[PDB]
């Protein structure tokens, strides 16, 4: 996240950190995700597409730091890794960029609630906040586009949703943005999601609940003027989510 503040998992208890094992010994961060129900985390298919080997990923809940442990964190293996079959990537956009990971611990259980682990709500079919709503994004992604490392502390920031009309202006993303995407930016193009934030949540209040309105998907640069962050529009995938969970 470019801008924002550092936070702790208590402020985003549904955030999931996904890592990959290289049996040479290292475990590297891949993407973020969000806990939907005790056994399911949702992220982005582009995070897994290149290495769909579920056995090589580890999912952690209750984590405030990237490589050090947080007291209360829970570690899970991926029992099922569902990627969207119509996932496509083009010159910028990723279409149908949503993925589901069914998690299981070594004891064979799913997540348990704690002050650091909570689920986030799903919107109702095709229901979104209106553009102008301020939503927050969280993640361990880059703080500057030129960095090659990720922060160790979790960060969060606020962005506002903008209209498709505005995001589809030729000088923004044109028709790269579809109705199955949402665009969010900071009025001053100062804070935004960046590399490493993929898979994470765009949370907005909807009907009184903190709802998972988007999944960090793609963007040109990070915090670039007229280059919003594009998120998968969760509200438009509810049938898909329900069919697999």
């Amino acid at each position: 996240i470019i801008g924002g503040e550092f936070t702790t998992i208590e402020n985003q208890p549904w955030f999931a950190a996904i890592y990959r094992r290289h049996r040479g010994g290292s475990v590297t961060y891949v993407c973020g995700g969000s806990l939907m129900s005790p056994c399911w985390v949702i992220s982005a298919t582009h995070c897994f597409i290149d290495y769909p080997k579920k056995e090589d990923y580890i999912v952690y809940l209750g984590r405030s730091r990237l490589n050090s442990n947080t007291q209360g964190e829970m570690k899970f293996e991926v029992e099922n890794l569902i990627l969207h079959k119509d996932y496509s990537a083009d010159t910028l956009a990723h279409h149908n960029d949503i993925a589901l990971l069914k998690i299981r611990s070594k004891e064979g259980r799913c997540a348990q609630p704690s002050r650091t682990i909570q689920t986030i709500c799903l919107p109702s079919m095709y229901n979104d906040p209106q553009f102008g709503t301020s939503c927050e994004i969280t993640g361990f992604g880059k703080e500057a586009s030129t960095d090659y490392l990720y922060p160790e502390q979790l960060k969060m920031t606020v962005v506002k949703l903008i209209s498709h009309r505005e995001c589809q202006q030729p000088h923004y993303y044109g028709s790269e943005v579809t109705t199955k995407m949402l665009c969010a930016a900071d009025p001053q193009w100062k804070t935004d999601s960046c590399q490493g934030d993929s898979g994470g949540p765009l949370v907005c209040s909807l009907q009184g609940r903190m709802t998972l309105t988007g999944i960090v998907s793609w963007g040109r640069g990070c915090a670039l003027k007229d280059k919003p962050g594009v998120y998968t529009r969760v509200s438009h995938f509810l049938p898909w989510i329900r069919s697999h969970t």
Binding site: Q12, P13, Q112, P113, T119, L122, M210
Partner: peptide, 13 residues
């Protein structure tokens, strides 16, 4: 009653 019921989506504690 079973742990799961304690999840309240959207709540921070």
């Amino acid at each position: 009653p079973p742990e799961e019921l304690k999840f309240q989506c959207g709540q921070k504690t």
